[PDB]
Design a protein around this ligand. Structure first.
Ligand SMILES: Nc1nc2c([nH]c(=O)n2[C@H]2C[C@H](O)[C@@H](COP(=O)(O)OP(=O)(O)OP(=O)(O)O)O2)c(=O)[nH]1
Ligand SMILES: [Ca+2]
Ligand SMILES: [Ca+2]
Ligand code: NA
Length: 327
DNA sequence: CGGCCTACG
DNA sequence: CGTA
DNA sequence: GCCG
């Protein structure tokens, strides 16, 4: 078992679902307290279990697995012996956890805002609605649409949506393409939102594209909310339903074709996978990775990549298809 | 112990 | 601060 | 919280 999640295949479904879910609760709670370090360890431990070829049945099977120390091992031990971990259950029922989860789920609210609201004594969505003067325009949209945004987006909804985005994109710039990224590209059948990556095969033609796309989507009556030169837009879209519609979060991002492999890799995730890949790159290879490129700070040069395969090769890693990046 | 991904709106 |  |  290698130490970085980007060094091992992690499938979407696996053999340790209950154990991973418990560790991820502890990870999430650590994030609500501002401990990114402990959030990372619990996420990494969870991800290790996702990568195993069969169920963990005995405590001895954790010996020598990376990211399992005294704490994560005790969590697994208790689950194996009793079916339940007292620490996890205490977190699940804490007012702090439940409220921070509720608030951070709102589009436009992060941990810092949620925590301040918690310290002010606020606990429910109706508490936030009663004092609407304190909300940003983003948070008001987030609150208004919260019920719809809490319903999973189905993979079966995505194709019709991609088609409407493609029509707007084709008008904005003939020849521009739309690629489905995020969890759906990793094989998920649901998601909290839809992620699209837009480019054009002629380098430079994509400049100024996103505003043109957004204007056209807005003219079609499809945009319930968006922030408005730019290259990422975090929107709420109107998605057709039988006799009606629902609000759906959609991310649109533009990249030049030179950067497309880096953008595709970054936006395809998973979030832990990409953090681990970037850490691997810097710490093991001395190269700086982001969604735009891969930089050698000794030579002061960018790696040219024509594919995700190129990027894995330049980092000395075995290629993983998107379906095995579910860290 | 230091480090924990790296960007854009 | 929010967002990915 | 864990790794190196
Ligand atoms: N490097 C980096 N990438 C991120 C972060 N947050 C984040 O979502 N991403 C990337 C990895 C994700 O898989 C991708 C899309 O984000 P997402 O929140 O829509 O996640 P998803 O599609 O996997 O999940 P979901 O919609 O099924 O819930 O963007 C971050 O903080 N850093
Ligand atoms: Ca998504
Ligand atoms: Ca997204
Ligand atoms: Na939020």
């Amino acid at each position: 078992m290698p130490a970085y999640a980007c060094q091992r295949p992690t499938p979407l479904t696996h053999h340790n679902t209950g154990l991973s879910e418990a560790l991820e609760i502890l990870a999430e709670a650590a994030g609500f307290e501002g401990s990114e370090g402990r959030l990372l360890t619990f996420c990494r431990a969870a991800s290790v279990l996702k990568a195993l070829p069969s169920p963990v049945t005995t405590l001895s099977q954790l010996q020598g697995l990376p990211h399992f120390g005294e704490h994560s091992s005790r969590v697994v031990q208790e689950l194996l012996e009793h079916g339940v971990c007292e620490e996890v259950e205490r977190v699940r029922r804490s007012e702090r956890y439940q409220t921070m989860k509720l608030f951070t789920q709102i589009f436009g609210v992060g941990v810092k805002t949620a925590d301040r609201w918690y310290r002010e004594g606020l606990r429910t969505l109706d508490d936030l609605r009663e004092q609407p003067q304190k909300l940003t325009q983003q948070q008001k949209a987030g609150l208004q649409h919260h019920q719809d945004l809490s319903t999973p987006v189905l993979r079966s909804d995505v194709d019709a949506l991609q088609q409407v985005v493609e029509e707007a994109v084709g008008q904005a710039l003939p020849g521009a393409t739309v690629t489905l990224t995020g969890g759906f590209r990793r094989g998920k059948l649901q998601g909290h939102d839809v992620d699209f990556l837009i480019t054009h095969p002629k380098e430079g033609q994509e400049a100024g594209l996103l505003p043109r796309v957004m204007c056209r989507l807005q003219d079609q009556g499809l945009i319930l909310y968006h922030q408005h030169a730019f290259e990422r837009s975090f929107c709420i879209f109107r998605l057709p339903q039988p006799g009606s519609w629902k609000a759906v979060r959609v991310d649109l991002v533009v990249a030049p074709v030179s950067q497309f492999p880096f953008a595709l890799l970054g936006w395809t995730g998973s979030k832990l996978f990409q953090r681990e890949l970037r850490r691997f790159s810097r710490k093991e290879k001395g190269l700086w990775l982001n969604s735009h490129g891969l930089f050698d700070p000794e030579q002061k040069t960018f790696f040219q990549a024509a594919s995700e395969e190129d990027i894995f090769r330049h980092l000395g890693l075995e290629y993983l298809p998107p379906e095995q990046r579910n860290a």
